[PDB]
Design an enzyme around this catalytic site. Structure first.
Site, PDB file in Angstrom:
ATOM      1  N   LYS A 157       0.844  -1.162   0.000  1.00 50.32           N
ATOM      2  CA  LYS A 157       0.000   0.000   0.000  1.00 50.32           C
ATOM      3  C   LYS A 157       0.875   1.205   0.000  1.00 50.32           C
ATOM      4  N   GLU A 183      -0.883   5.860  10.826  1.00 54.33           N
ATOM      5  CA  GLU A 183       0.279   5.368  10.150  1.00 54.33           C
ATOM      6  C   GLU A 183       1.176   4.605  11.056  1.00 54.33           C
ATOM      7  N   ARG A 184       1.995   3.738  10.413  1.00 52.81           N
ATOM      8  CA  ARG A 184       2.898   2.815  11.035  1.00 52.81           C
ATOM      9  C   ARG A 184       4.143   3.646  11.044  1.00 52.81           C
TER      10      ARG A 184
END
Lengths: 469, 219, 53, 470
Positions: A157, A183-184
């Site tokens: 992604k 978000e990571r």
């Protein structure tokens, strides 16, 4: 304000305050609760009456002693914006967490804003190339278009979006917005490092991007309104600086998911699956605060982390309503080993049509779809039996389609490291030529190994020669 | 804009309740569009009402009902969805000549949720309606566009709503197509075919191409 | 010689077919089982919804 | 004490709660009339909440309502009109002429509710009501005083089938009929009204041999639910207190189930399976049991049933399958083959059909037909891949006989004008037995498949064979 209260309850990050006066905030007003965690900024969402509101808490909750003073700071909080938002990664509060220190205010705008009207629209249908072949053929972008990915669990992604940033956002001006909801953090650091390196963030100069990053460890209530803040920055660029902008959201499933979580606590009866009954409305507001205007044309690409797939889950279904093009990416096509992992039978754009992007282009794409649909159709019979127990004509079609399937690969130029393989970027002009040839089966005579995991038609041919050695 | 280019918005009215616009307003929007139609109908003027999408009406009424915390029906769509849709739909009629002849014609439009027509809202509508126009997405990819799956499409009013000339010509069109569909399925199990089946198949293929429609072409 | 090969091939092929069908049986069985579980879940959700309202 | 006055307390859609005053006891199943400028709104009392506060369901729109509004109580179920003025007038839920041919009622009214007759009273006559329709007569013969059920999907010539039955069975039938339409279209109403003026059944000078109760789908669920009770009571008056045989017709009874489900839900009764009412069994049972052959008369109900999305398992269809004596199921596949009636023989079963009950010969012929068809269905798979391989001489004949039988079911309809345009074929009982026997014997095995297509009796089977022959 004389609107002071105490905190009656703290049930999750959905605090309840009891104001001590009959002067009350209003809905979407903002409160600052002074705590040893500094100010906590909350937004009134319900009035449960008798001067007891129920408030979404947009700053994380814990260690809160009941009966803690509140002060009403009113309205939807106004962040401080400028072109000095550019080159800043901002937390929910609006504070630079890339720590260049406070944003120079010019206009400070309320986080919640009204969505522009049917009369404030502007109609576009532009061509915009993505430098991705499959995308160009099936769903060629526009300059205000709203594209959405419906990526599965880590289906590259980030990689896809990075590719889009790498091509499209260096081919678009005005301004461009990256907003990453839930978000990571590590992935964000990679992006941040890469951006500064590629000058997208240039801090010596001006950055042509601004950034909002809200981590997924941020409590649910915060994550919901990470989005609203991002939309305001986008509006500042769109409207008051008038620019044709860009916007990235990763993921807007996190927005939906955050809504589903809060719904129970808010007292709302969570509709089907669990998503808020206000899922439809909230998706609508957001997507009409992202809609194109005659003051600025904002291309949005929004990543939907479809949970366990199934797009008839209410949130992906309501996403489809608000996207002019979609590029559904699915795990099955990923499993088939094709990178990009974009479904070729599940991409659409209204721009694809007739001579809008060329009748010939449209004709070539049509043929690809028919061939593939036949090819997918006969997969049952072919596997149980063989391809020989179907017609020779069909066998040519199948053989052609297997090649097309393999051909659709185009190594990523931002996961070139991760894959190992150097990326490939293929022009729209090149794409029409390439597929045209293949449909006539001209290159249907050279290895399917050659077709596999490579970009351009020329590259296939060259790899045929390489294989032959 | 498409309507203005084709200058059909010298008679098109668009009633809107965009997704931004309130769920109460969304619920109220079909019934007030109907009222506008009834005025035309009353005047003896004829009109046709497209309801796109009624499925989203049900979501809106659901939201409303669940925030008035009334006992909801299956799939959380309140158990009186049928009452909303039925009262709405039976207002479209071709009136008698003692009623000014005026006919509002309705085309309700529901969006299939993976062809899940056994879902409460699609099932209800099917019972109410005089036809089904089931489309197929697979046939969209197959190249048709508009792409229709006519095996699950019906018109229960027969050829009384059909043009007389067209009734005569398309008399055996259904039969040919019915034979084509059957033969085509059989053919894929790779059984050897006699001339009688291949007459059907060969005729059938020509018919299939005849059916195909391309977007934005009237005739 | 040709005929012998013909009937032999038919046997060989029809055997290979059966194996492939078994695998598809397994794949749809897992899907079937999953779909059963999901239906049960959705029914229970309905009951809960009814009581909750 | 207090006058018979209730004040509205909560209008939450159809549910309207009323607050009868302190000192008056209400009773359940009443009918409340509130005089409103929208006519008197009727609320059927459905719960007591105590302290003389009722929770009632509305039968009509609840717009304009004001909390505080005086409510008279009739005190018992809605009282409809019964008589022979009912015969040839269209009545609505509240028992009012919507045909506007003036007053309906003889000198009597009756309540909508009535109760299932005693075990002694409910004893039925096993007699065979032939219709002249070969598929029906042979493979699921209708029976006197019966509870026929015209199960089929959505509009597979469903309307055509029922209409044909009205033409055949109604004219034939000695008694009266009552045509009741539960939640059916206003197009469907107008067609039925027009059709039976045409059939003359509705004779607008003098009595009609039918009565009509058209309740249409626009009407709220509450009215859709208690339309059933109303139509049923008119028939009971004919059966009982006029003696006169009836032959009830209801359309479509899935709407009655559906209507009831909704008002269970609205009342806050925690729904049962697939959103169907908890009281599903007993309410269906109450409708059916009320319809019976008493010692005062005999009523032969024919109730249309819509099988939503061919879902039979769905409790509302599954419950009706038990409840109805002489089923006929129309299946999509058979419809598509062009076989109209689309009645699937395997799925069409009637209580009477066995042994010498319908004639020993008739039974044997029908046993042979079913076996022949069942093999053909199995053979479709063999033919699909293998084709003619592993198919004997016998199998090809079975395919051919089944195909000949397959189109032998197809029979014209009188109704067919714009549906086909081929007037119906009424085939004598003796003739149908003979014709199927001949086919099976192979006396008509030199006869094409299509020479049974849309034919009637033995003369017809031969005649359409002749037409192809020459």
């Amino acid at each position: 304000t004389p609107i002071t209260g105490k905190v009656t309850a703290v049930i999750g990050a959905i605090v309840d305050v009891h104001f001590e006066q009959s002067e009350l905030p209003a809905i979407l007003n903002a409160l600052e609760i002074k705590t040893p965690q500094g100010k906590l900024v909350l937004e009134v969402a319900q009035h449960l009456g008798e001067n007891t509101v129920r408030t979404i808490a947009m700053d994380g909750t814990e260690g809160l002693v009941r009966g803690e003073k509140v002060l009403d700071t009113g309205g939807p909080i106004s962040v401080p914006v400028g072109r000095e938002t550019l080159g800043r990664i901002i937390n929910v509060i609006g504070e630079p967490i890339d720590e260049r220190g406070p944003i120079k205010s010019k206009l400070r705008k309320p986080i919640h804003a009204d969505p522009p009207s049917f009369a404030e629209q502007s109609t576009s249908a532009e061509i915009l190339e993505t430098g991705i072949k499959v995308v160009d053929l099936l769903a060629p972008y526009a300059r205000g278009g709203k594209i959405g990915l419906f990526g599965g669990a880590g289906v590259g992604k980030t990689v896809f979006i990075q590719e889009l940033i790498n091509n499209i956002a260096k081919a678009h001006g005005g301004f461009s917005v990256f907003t990453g909801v839930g978000e990571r953090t590590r992935e964000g650091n990679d992006l941040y490092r890469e951006m500064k390196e590629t000058g997208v963030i240039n801090l010596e100069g001006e950055s042509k991007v601004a950034l909002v990053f809200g981590q997924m460890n941020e409590p649910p209530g915060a994550r919901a309104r990470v989005a609203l803040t991002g939309l305001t920055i986008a509006e500042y660029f769109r409207d008051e600086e008038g620019q044709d902008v860009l916007l990235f959201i990763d993921n807007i499933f996190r927005f939906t998911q955050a809504g589903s979580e809060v719904s129970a606590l808010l007292g709302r009866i969570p509709s089907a699956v669990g998503y808020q009954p206000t899922l439809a409305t909230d998706m609508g507001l957001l997507q009409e605060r992202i809609t194109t205007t005659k003051k600025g044309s904002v291309t949005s690409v929004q990543a939907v982390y479809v949970p366990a797939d199934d797009l008839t889950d209410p949130a992906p279904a309501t996403t489809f309503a608000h996207l002019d093009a979609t590029t559904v990416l699915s795990r099955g096509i990923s499993e088939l080993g094709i990178y990009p992992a974009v479904d070729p039978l599940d991409s659409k754009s209204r721009l694809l049509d007739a001579a809008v992007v060329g009748q010939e282009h449209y004709d070539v794409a049509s043929k690809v779809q028919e061939t593939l649909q036949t090819y997918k159709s006969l997969q049952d019979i072919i596997a149980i039996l063989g391809m020989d127990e179907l017609s020779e004509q069909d066998k040519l079609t199948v053989e052609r389609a297997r090649k097309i399937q393999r051909f659709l690969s185009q190594p990523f130029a931002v996961a070139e490291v991760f894959t190992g393989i150097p990326g490939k970027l293929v022009r729209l002009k090149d794409t029409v030529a390439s597929f045209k040839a293949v449909l006539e089966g001209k290159y249907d005579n050279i290895p399917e190994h050659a077709f596999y995991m490579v970009g351009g038609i020329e590259d296939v041919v060259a790899k045929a020669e390489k294989l032959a050695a | 804009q498409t309507l203005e280019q084709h200058d059909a918005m010298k008679y098109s009215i668009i009633v809107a309740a965009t997704a931004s616009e309130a769920a109460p307003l969304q619920y109220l929007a079909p019934f007030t569009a109907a009222s506008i139609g009834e005025w035309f109908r009353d005047n003896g003027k004829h009109a046709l009402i497209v309801y796109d999408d009624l499925s989203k009406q049900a979501v809106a009424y659901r939201q409303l009902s669940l925030l008035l915390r009334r006992p909801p029906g299956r799939e959380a769509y309140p158990g009186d969805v049928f009452y909303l849709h039925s009262r709405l739909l039976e207002r479209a009629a071709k009136l008698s000549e003692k009623e000014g002849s005026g006919s509002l014609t309705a085309l309700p439009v529901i969006e299939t949720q993976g062809g899940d027509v056994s879902a409460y809202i699609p099932t209800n509508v099917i019972s109410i309606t005089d036809g089904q126009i089931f489309l197929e997405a697979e046939l969209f990819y197959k190249g048709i566009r508009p792409a229709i799956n006519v095996g699950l499409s019906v018109s229960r009013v027969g050829s009384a709503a059909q043009v007389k000339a067209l009734k005569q010509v398309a008399g055996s069109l259904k039969l040919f197509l019915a034979q084509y569909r059957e033969v085509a399925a059989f053919a894929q199990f790779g059984s050897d075919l006699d001339a009688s089946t291949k007459q059907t198949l060969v005729r059938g293929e020509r018919l299939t191409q005849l059916l195909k429609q391309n977007q934005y072409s009237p005739l | 010689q040709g005929y012998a090969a013909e009937i032999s091939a038919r046997r060989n092929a029809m055997d290979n077919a059966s194996k492939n069908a078994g695998d598809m049986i397994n794949r749809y069985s897992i899907l079937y089982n999953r779909t059963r579980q999901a239906v049960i879940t959705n029914e229970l959700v309905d009951i809960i919804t009814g009581a909750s309202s």
